[PDB]
Symmetry: D3
Subunit: 106 residues, 6 copies
Amino acid sequence: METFTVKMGADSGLLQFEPANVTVHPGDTVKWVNNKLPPHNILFDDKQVPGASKELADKLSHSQLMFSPGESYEITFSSDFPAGTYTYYCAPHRGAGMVGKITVEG
Amino acid sequence: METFTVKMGADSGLLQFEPANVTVHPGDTVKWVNNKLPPHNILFDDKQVPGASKELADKLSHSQLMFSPGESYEITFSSDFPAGTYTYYCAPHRGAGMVGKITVEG
Amino acid sequence: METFTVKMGADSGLLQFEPANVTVHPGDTVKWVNNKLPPHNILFDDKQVPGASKELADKLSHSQLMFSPGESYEITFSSDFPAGTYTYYCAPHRGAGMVGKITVEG
Amino acid sequence: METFTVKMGADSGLLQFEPANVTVHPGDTVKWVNNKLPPHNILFDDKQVPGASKELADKLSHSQLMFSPGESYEITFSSDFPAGTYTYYCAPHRGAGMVGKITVEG
Amino acid sequence: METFTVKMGADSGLLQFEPANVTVHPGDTVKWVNNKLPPHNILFDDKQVPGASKELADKLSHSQLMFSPGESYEITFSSDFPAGTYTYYCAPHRGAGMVGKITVEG
Amino acid sequence: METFTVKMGADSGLLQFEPANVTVHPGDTVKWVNNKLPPHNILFDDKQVPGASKELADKLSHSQLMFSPGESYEITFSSDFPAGTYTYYCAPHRGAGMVGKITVEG
Ligand SMILES: [Cu+2]
Ligand SMILES: [Cu+2]
Ligand SMILES: [Cu+2]
Ligand SMILES: [Cu+2]
Ligand SMILES: [Cu+2]
Ligand SMILES: [Cu+2]
Ligand SMILES: [Zn+2]
Ligand SMILES: [Zn+2]
Ligand SMILES: [Zn+2]
Ligand SMILES: [Zn+2]
Ligand SMILES: [Zn+2]
Ligand SMILES: [Zn+2]
Ligand SMILES: [Zn+2]
Ligand SMILES: [Zn+2]
Ligand SMILES: [Zn+2]
Ligand SMILES: [Zn+2]
Ligand SMILES: [Zn+2]
Ligand SMILES: [Zn+2]
Ligand SMILES: [Zn+2]
Ligand SMILES: [Zn+2]
């Protein structure tokens, strides 16, 4: 049972989540930490989560912008969460391809 | 049991939903398709749905922007949904009066 | 039992919630009325409401922009709402420190 | 010696200049009038005027936004102006292809 | 021969130039100093300066945004400047009525 | 005599002018080419060019946004341009420190 940290804005100054792709196990937690060039947010589309569930995509999205360095958000993927891929994106930096994918393994 | 299709942005290039007003029967589905001049989204204000239920207005809204041509979002109005009007709008094009109204009938 | 009115944007023209800090009881209602310099919205971060409950913060947030004068949003704090502080802000005027705080008491 | 009027935003509500293409004679004047869905402006890029003269493109642009209905801006093409095409666009509505072209003839 | 300082954003936090109205004499200088709630800029419309001269309105406009406190801009009104009123506005805060007027006396 | 190319947005995806700092001679040309993550523009503040000449800073600024890849703007620095440093920036990516500097030598 582990916590994976994802940086919001690469140290370099690149507009990415790093790491962009993470694989986690039921019981684990992804923690987003505000890093370079804020603001960022974390959105999952209706069609971009297991079973295309809007209820679930909405529950997980953190649409509110995160401004100061240090600001964070955790999603902990309990065994209620269906296995599969959770593709998310940052709204202000969608143009730049600020994208991420979480895979919940088996 | 049928699916009504609403275009986002008229073929003409006008910034409206087309058709803006639709009447539907319980069990039917409304499907928005991204047509002209993206991006669009679909918002239902708290006071704009039967019983002014924010819980329900929120469930239905798709506040995330739809950018690419062909993207779609469906609401299907099962027998849980109260009879009456559901009035909505596109945030980016609020200024242009890009508004719509679904009427759940009988 | 009562309804506390909160102006969005002060009479003077300052970008504030007025009154900013409010103490309510179980059974009471907070009503936000659109006043000066719209648009405004009312956002609760996940970490900013008792128990740090995102479910709660999301249910309470009115992220949709309120534009026309006199537009309103009420939250009525029943026995169900946990006692404690609910700290909110206005997205468009966050830079200006357009912030507020509701304290549910006993 | 005449004045051609160009509407900013078609009566239909379409985001174009109307008429988008105009031919004028030396000594004539083009007058833009703010019509539907303000705000608009008029920009001529450096490379979009005869001889790709930035000095001239800049003179002609009215980058400031026109907000209220009835606002207008005139260019009058005296004999100083080189013969040829002057292609322009509206910044806010670039995405919608709100573009126009004046042709100074003979 | 004097320099009139104008604050960009009132100490209170109000979105105004203070003083909003200034009367100056040929040879004097108005100095805008970035104060509260940046960014601000200073625009004069074509029609808003003596003789409706776009050449003059453009020369005087400081459209570029001013971000850090302390940033400034001077216009010194030599006797080439025609007497009369120079109405200007801040673009980001046009909605708020962030407006100013300089009168060049006799 | 030569043309110095400056990429707008680095190959890597960083929001930079590349090369940022450039030394040119009288007779030489600086060409900005639109590269990654558009749009960009090229702004010279009034205080940021030799003699603090606004006339000069404005003549040189390309405030209009460049959108499509390969779009370009050249400034060719003749005997007429005062020796010294011309410091520029990109409005949209100012937050990211998308800055540059041209030094005209002897
Ligand atoms: Cu981002
Ligand atoms: Cu739309
Ligand atoms: Cu506000
Ligand atoms: Cu327009
Ligand atoms: Cu301002
Ligand atoms: Cu840039
Ligand atoms: Zn694990
Ligand atoms: Zn969607
Ligand atoms: Zn039916
Ligand atoms: Zn509402
Ligand atoms: Zn009472
Ligand atoms: Zn009470
Ligand atoms: Zn948060
Ligand atoms: Zn003619
Ligand atoms: Zn250009
Ligand atoms: Zn004086
Ligand atoms: Zn004008
Ligand atoms: Zn050479
Ligand atoms: Zn050289
Ligand atoms: Zn300046």
